[PDB]
Design a protein around this motif. Structure first.
Motif, short mmCIF file in Angstrom:
data_model
loop_
_atom_site.label_atom_id
_atom_site.label_comp_id
_atom_site.label_asym_id
_atom_site.label_seq_id
_atom_site.Cartn_x
_atom_site.Cartn_y
_atom_site.Cartn_z
N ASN D 102 0.79 -1.19 -0.01
CA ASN D 102 0.12 -0.04 -0.03
C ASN D 102 0.86 1.26 0.13
N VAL D 106 -0.27 5.84 0.82
CA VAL D 106 0.60 6.32 1.84
C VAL D 106 1.07 7.94 1.19
N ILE D 151 13.05 10.97 5.12
CA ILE D 151 14.19 10.12 6.03
C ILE D 151 13.46 8.63 5.97
N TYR D 153 14.58 6.19 2.64
CA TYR D 153 14.12 6.18 1.20
C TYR D 153 13.98 4.72 0.59
N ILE D 156 8.29 3.67 -0.13
CA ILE D 156 7.39 5.13 0.05
C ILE D 156 8.11 6.27 -0.31
N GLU D 177 21.58 3.63 4.32
CA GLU D 177 21.87 2.89 3.49
C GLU D 177 22.05 3.75 2.16
N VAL D 205 10.53 5.29 7.59
CA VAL D 205 11.43 4.49 8.41
C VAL D 205 10.66 3.42 8.99
N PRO D 206 11.32 2.19 8.97
CA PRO D 206 10.78 0.98 9.72
C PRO D 206 10.96 1.01 11.27
N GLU D 207 10.14 0.20 11.82
CA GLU D 207 10.12 0.22 13.24
C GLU D 207 11.18 -0.83 13.89
N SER D 210 17.06 1.12 16.40
CA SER D 210 17.72 2.37 16.02
C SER D 210 16.54 3.60 15.68
N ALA D 232 3.95 9.49 9.12
CA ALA D 232 3.02 8.15 8.66
C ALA D 232 3.49 6.95 8.55
N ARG D 234 5.85 4.78 11.58
CA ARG D 234 5.53 4.18 12.77
C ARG D 234 5.29 4.95 13.86
N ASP D 258 -0.18 10.32 11.84
CA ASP D 258 -1.08 9.30 11.28
C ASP D 258 -0.89 8.02 12.23
N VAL D 259 0.25 7.77 12.74
CA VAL D 259 0.52 6.93 13.78
C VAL D 259 0.90 7.32 15.12
N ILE D 287 -4.59 5.81 9.17
CA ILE D 287 -5.00 5.45 7.75
C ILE D 287 -3.76 5.87 6.71
N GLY D 289 -2.89 3.72 4.40
CA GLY D 289 -2.81 2.78 3.93
C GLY D 289 -4.26 2.20 3.68
N1 NAD Z 1 0.65 4.93 8.27
C1 NAD Z 1 0.48 3.75 7.65
O1 NAD Z 1 -0.76 3.42 7.42
C2 NAD Z 1 1.72 2.94 6.90
C3 NAD Z 1 1.28 2.17 5.86
C4 NAD Z 1 2.21 1.31 5.10
C5 NAD Z 1 3.67 1.42 5.60
N2 NAD Z 1 4.05 2.29 6.77
C6 NAD Z 1 5.17 2.50 7.12
O2 NAD Z 1 6.23 3.19 6.53
C7 NAD Z 1 7.53 2.94 6.86
C8 NAD Z 1 8.36 2.57 5.37
O3 NAD Z 1 7.63 1.54 4.65
P1 NAD Z 1 8.37 1.36 3.33
O4 NAD Z 1 7.17 0.10 2.77
O5 NAD Z 1 8.79 2.22 2.26
O6 NAD Z 1 9.70 0.48 3.74
P2 NAD Z 1 10.84 0.24 3.25
O7 NAD Z 1 11.55 -0.94 4.45
O8 NAD Z 1 11.04 -0.13 1.82
O9 NAD Z 1 12.07 1.34 3.35
C9 NAD Z 1 12.40 2.05 4.54
C10 NAD Z 1 13.63 2.81 4.44
O10 NAD Z 1 14.30 3.16 5.70
C11 NAD Z 1 15.64 3.08 5.52
N3 NAD Z 1 16.35 3.28 6.86
C12 NAD Z 1 16.02 2.45 7.98
N4 NAD Z 1 16.57 2.91 9.04
C13 NAD Z 1 16.78 4.47 8.70
C14 NAD Z 1 17.23 5.23 9.45
N5 NAD Z 1 17.57 4.61 10.79
N6 NAD Z 1 17.63 6.08 8.95
C15 NAD Z 1 17.64 6.48 7.73
N7 NAD Z 1 17.29 5.55 6.71
C16 NAD Z 1 16.66 4.34 7.35
C17 NAD Z 1 15.91 1.85 4.84
O11 NAD Z 1 17.29 1.69 4.44
C18 NAD Z 1 14.77 1.91 3.78
O12 NAD Z 1 15.29 2.25 2.60
C19 NAD Z 1 7.48 1.57 7.57
O13 NAD Z 1 7.46 1.62 8.80
C20 NAD Z 1 6.19 1.07 7.15
O14 NAD Z 1 5.32 0.21 8.56
C21 NAD Z 1 2.80 2.91 7.42
#
Ligand code: NAD
Ligand code: NAD
Ligand code: NAD
Ligand code: NAD
Lengths: 404, 404, 404, 404
Positions: D102, D106, D151, D153, D156, D177, D205-207, D210, D232, D234, D258-259, D287, D289
């Motif tokens: 999704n 976002v 922050i 890349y 999304i 990275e 960024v992911p949950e 760090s 939007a 975590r 959003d979160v 929301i 997603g």
């Molecule tokens: N709000 C919503 O409803 C909703 C919906 C879908 C996804 N999300 C969230 O969006 C976030 C990103 O999603 P995605 O699918 O693009 O993920 P992704 O894993 O493709 O991209 C995450 C990026 O974060 C980078 N990274 C990791 N730690 C970092 C840090 N410490 N500093 C700088 N860069 C960092 C990674 O290298 C990567 O390129 C996730 O947490 C996901 O859960 C939220």
């Protein structure tokens, strides 16, 4: 309008011009696919109202003095010195031309030449024809990712810059004046900087003293090793001998030259240049502007300028004349060409004042020794006819006319 | 990464390949800017493990059989017929190449070529270099608004089309396999329609008995008179004597040929063709792929395929081997090439079972009569080495190797 | 450039205007962040030469007549009805404004608004701020692939469309004047078609008895159920009570209103409307034009129009004056506003003729009952000043001024 | 295929999933628009072969232990912890989900929110509803020309960067990275640099450890005055209290969240947050997603993963299982799930060896305590049936199946 007004188109003017004229009602056209013999040129011009020429015919003083009904001169080309400009002005005859009429062509030429020059194609082909197979990858490069260097960011420089970005290049430029970069072109402060970082340099500068042998030994020696130079502007901007030494010494990988210092006056005259020794050089007979579509819009443009002048007195863009144009609105428009001196205008205005006629709008612009003025009056056909006869009598008058 | 794993590189493979081997800890490199004759090739390839060759070296069964330490073959080009595929597979020696490694180059070439051909530049440059000025601008045209007929909407067709679109041209294609048009491309039902409609026709179809002499004297006719023909695909597609007649008859304005029926063995060979007589025809020594950027990329691609096989038996894009690749994770990796007969794998696995050695991962892919398997086991160097020995002694074993 | 040419600026005109006046050597500036009441306005505007005002100041004949040194009026906005045009023209006082100075702002606003309205964000944010979690994601949609119905393909419609296209939406427009669609826009024949077809409907039509209450209860019906309505044009175009019924009946999912029928006189005034009850409706205080960038540009535009008139009598974009502008070249420039009666110009020119003063250029444009003329003469300050005096004493003279 | 295999879709799974399944022949589907009551959940699951759930149902040990015919688990969402992963693995049941399902949503959310946040719309609207008219230009800006700071890349961040450039912004990014910038995005070395120059910052960024309270007092204090923050990703990445102080002190102009750290478990639970005091803040119920099109492709994707597993043993992307997939080609495919220990595979291979059956291809991947292997044999329906019965008897076997 008026089937009585004669137009003399000469030197193979584009058909599109003939259509334009005809759409305007001007149907008295004498066509000629080539330049006329001086004797018949005079025979054709004497009774002619408008002359459309190119660059072969030379309209000199006694030729101009031969046309008694001449209203305007249309140059179907950018070059405009095959005509006695001030001898025409002196007779109240404005000269029009088509300056920025062929830019897409010149740009299409440069993109094409740089692609292949960067590939060593001119040489490999020269050899292929001579029977030798010379397959090498050695110094062949793709246009994508290369830096183009434009000197003279005007009408053409812009176009080239746009097209080049489509091919994946980085365009930078240098102009004596600060310009607004189109797309992602990047203006560079000093020539040296440009020269130092450009793979292929292209010149789109005008002819004048500051550009004379602009690119010489020094400038060329500043170009990064293995670069290309493309000159399709004016044959006086590049120091040829200096250019031969860089080529000879492999400083430059090749070059493209479309304009030279001295060019044959006719296809029947021999071309001669040191550049002929190099296979890695594309020599072209001053074309680049010479494309069918260019001739097409040149025709539309200048036949248009002649029509507007005819219909409403507009002299904008006129080469040898003061520039005036007046937003047409309201019946009765007359014009006056005369000696620039005191009291002429007052006497002109009096005619209407003393007839109780209202002047709706009036524009007067003046040159050194002559003045042009367009006038709008809230009057009737007859009163107009009247004032005209009077206008002609004002001491200083050279020409007067009722446009509508 | 090994000090005595000899790499034999011939025909001047790009520096980036050499660079990447070393990066992978591969030092023993015997480079050769040119080709090596059979007699000399043998002495070199003998104790060589890997060989990188191009379009000129011929690895015949004889040579392959003379190669003792030959583990893998790498073709730094898109062609692979210069090596006996079968004689290689039979020895558990896979061959790699660069499938579609130079499409932008051919695309750039044709863009640049058509632009100049449309403008009469090849003929003008020819005469100019012979002291002849030729300003006949009547047949000069601009690319913008013209129609480009692409026969073969493949990897190159789709690329050539995109660029063509940026210049303002209209693209139409005729393919055998109905495909999804990228950009504003229009698929034509018949060749006759496209031929009779296009201004510039470019071929980008594969070589095979179906395309052999495709552009016959009849097709050439169906072409709009005054058009242009450009062929940078394979030398068998166009009937040249027909081509020559068309040019002399003026039915075609010009052409650009890069691939010929018969081509020179090397650059020291004489090139002969009837097209040499026409100035309006661009002849090039099978270049258009020969570009530093394309070479660099091919160098980087194929070398990487060699490392990946050496370091972890991946045979993914191999043209003669079964395609297997296993995620690199965990200690001890072995591989085993063998005849595709029932029972060989069970006997291979048994070796570890009876030894109480746990197998972590295993991938077996099978060719028509060959089988390739790669195994990850949780053991150490001793058991590994000892286990290697056993595998080599299995019925139908072609090869076995301890990757790490 | 003058030390005592008083500039009265009210209603907080952007700093860039203030900046540009000074650049033009204009120092005497009386600034006011807010509006000035009639009583106070008069004391300020009295010895003021120029005034820059906005949508709140009201220059009524009374005030205009109280202005003694008032030379030109400048409206830093697109609206101009806040000043008595006629009472200004009659005094030879032209009024300038900023015609189409804020289209990108309204375009950005609607893009952002629809995106969130489609997603239910306005209502969710409302409840969330009241401690209510509302994850009802059923009605949430993505803009990509949706249909945007633009009623009024004008300066803003064409802009809104372009952006909409970038997000992946499909654009359809309904205009009264058949126009050339930019991008992949499709002109619809009827409103019913568009209304019944669109997902999001946005209005961008001018105010006039033709658009008054355009979106009546019937049009609202013709709209696809579940759609959205966005109005950032003028407050009279939509029937609000109808709008409210549609929302409560769920026929419409949401809406975004920026312009209302009746709007608050100032920010201290109470805002009332039935729409306030709906959370799914975005209500904004006539913003969407109120953007720093738009203000900056308006500030830069209108101030520049004031200088150009002050320094060289150009009245090009004036909404009440005849439009004249003369190329600035040569010494001595005067101007003369007067009644459009026969004879005034002849008597004006005579002044110089009898003095043997040569007139270099002259432009006279005439309004329905007014006439504006500007003259270039080859003389000096004395004759100029002395000549000014005479002109002011001519029958029907409204004004005369020595520009330089 | 097989009308005998039962699928249990629960929690209002998208209709598109039901279509996919049916196209595959799997027509035994039990649908439920909501979460099932524990008692009937078990009644439904016991005889079920596949379970498709969302995030409300919690598939725990005794629930999993209740389904005796369970083959695979499909999570129609990204979240996957409402299921006993290793309790499923232990029973040879792989779990699939839709991770990057999704992203467009976002991104559409963020573009929209930043446009309006930059305009002060959330507040002006909050006030408009409360009856106050607050028209100000003071700090409203157009998106065009602004710098966006991403922050994270990843999936999304890329999309947002692309869409943003369409609106005329300059996107910069920061990732732990090194990434390949799309379009004209610019990677920034240190966060500080990003923070210092970004008008609006967005976190994708992911949950994990760090990123826990990644954006705190320090980081926020580094953001240029008057900037916006949009979170939007975590709810654990932003220090809320620290965020309230910047808002309160006007360091930040507004924000979009959003979160949150702790979110209500159902719409019937009260939301509570310090962010509720601010009008210049868009609070959304997790929301972004939650859009109809997202649910649509989530359905297609996971119903697809379940189908592929069913049909050909592919476990790629499986959450709690070793990953294997084998290019299907040739009849007879069986699979085996067992204890990871010596001799299991050998005994498996023996069955065929001793029957003179040829193994065409075999893939075995292993986890900590379990191994999965897909096998292709050149055999007939009967022989397959035979070997299956035998396979099941191999000590260590957990599950074995004939795919085709
Ligand atoms: N709000 C919503 O409803 C909703 C919906 C879908 C996804 N999300 C969230 O969006 C976030 C990103 O999603 P995605 O699918 O693009 O993920 P992704 O894993 O493709 O991209 C995450 C990026 O974060 C980078 N990274 C990791 N730690 C970092 C840090 N410490 N500093 C700088 N860069 C960092 C990674 O290298 C990567 O390129 C996730 O947490 C996901 O859960 C939220
Ligand atoms: N080869 C052909 O057949 C052909 C055809 C048409 C035009 N031209 C030539 O191309 C040249 C450029 O044409 P254009 O129509 O674009 O003209 P242009 O006048 O629009 O642009 C010329 C540019 O040169 C810049 N400039 C002037 N001197 C310079 C200098 N000393 N250094 C750096 N910048 C300089 C100017 O500021 C301007 O932007 C002209 O000489 C014209 O005659 C050649
Ligand atoms: N001159 C050079 O140096 C050089 C360099 C690279 C490739 N090549 C040539 O380029 C050609 C095309 O390369 P590519 O990678 O784009 O090709 P491709 O293999 O990707 O696609 C070629 C297309 O031709 C189409 N086709 C097949 N037969 C056809 C027929 N009889 N009539 C019409 N269409 C037909 C196919 O459907 C396919 O779409 C290759 O065949 C090769 O000859 C030459
Ligand atoms: N809300 C704001 O702050 C704000 C800011 C700027 C402008 N405005 C509004 O934006 C509106 C449009 O501005 P613009 O500059 O794009 O307009 P415009 O004047 O350039 O074009 C408006 C279009 O509406 C079309 N039209 C006229 N009557 C119509 C009808 N009855 N039905 C359908 N189409 C019709 C016209 O043909 C024209 O093409 C203005 O009328 C003004 O109300 C409001």
């Amino acid at each position: 309008e008026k089937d009585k007004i004669k137009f003399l188109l000469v030197e193979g003017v584009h058909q599109k011009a003939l259509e334009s004229l005809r759409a305007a009602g001007y149907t008295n056209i004498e066509f000629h696919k080539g330049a006329l013999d001086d004797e018949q040129l005079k025979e054709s011009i004497r009774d002619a109202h408008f002359i459309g020429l190119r660059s072969r015919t030379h309209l000199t003083e006694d030729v101009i003095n031969a046309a008694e009904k001449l209203v305007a001169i249309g140059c179907f080309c950018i070059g405009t010195n095959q005509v006695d400009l001030d001898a025409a002005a002196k007779r109240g005859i404005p000269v029009f031309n088509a300056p920025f009429s062929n830019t897409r062509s010149v740009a299409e030429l440069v993109i094409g030449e740089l692609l292949l020059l960067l590939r060593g194609v001119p040489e490999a082909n020269a050899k292929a024809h001579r029977g030798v197979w010379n397959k090498l990858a050695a110094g062949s490069f793709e246009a994508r990712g290369k830096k183009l260097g434009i000197i003279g960011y005007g009408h053409i420089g812009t176009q080239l810059g746009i097209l080049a970005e489509s091919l994946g290049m980085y365009v930078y430029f240098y102009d004596i004046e600060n310009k607004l970069p189109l797309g992602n072109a990047t203006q560079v402060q000093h020539l040296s900087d440009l020269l130092n970082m450009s793979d292929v340099v292209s010149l789109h500068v005008p002819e004048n003293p500051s550009t004379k042998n602009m690119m010489g030994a020094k400038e060329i020696s500043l170009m990064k090793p293995g670069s290309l130079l493309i000159n399709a502007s004016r044959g006086t901007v590049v120091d040829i001998p200096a250019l031969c030494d860089a080529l000879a010494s492999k400083h430059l990988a090749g070059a493209a030259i479309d304009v030279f210092p001295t060019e044959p006056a006719t296809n029947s005259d021999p071309f001669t240049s040191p550049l002929c020794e190099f296979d890695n050089v594309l020599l072209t007979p001053h074309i680049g502007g010479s494309t069918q579509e260019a001739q097409e819009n040149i025709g539309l443009e200048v036949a248009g300028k002649l029509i507007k002048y005819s219909d409403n007195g507009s002299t904008l863009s006129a080469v040898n004349f003061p520039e005036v144009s007046l937003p047409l609105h309201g019946g009765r428009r007359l014009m006056h060409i005369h000696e620039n001196r005191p009291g002429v205008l007052t006497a002109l205005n009096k005619i209407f004042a003393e007839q109780g006629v209202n002047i709706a709008a009036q524009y007067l612009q003046t040159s050194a020794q002559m003045g042009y003025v367009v006038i709008d009056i809230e009057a009737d056909e007859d009163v107009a006819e009247k004032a005209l006869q009077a206008m002609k009598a004002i001491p200083g008058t050279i020409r007067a006319r009722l446009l509508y």
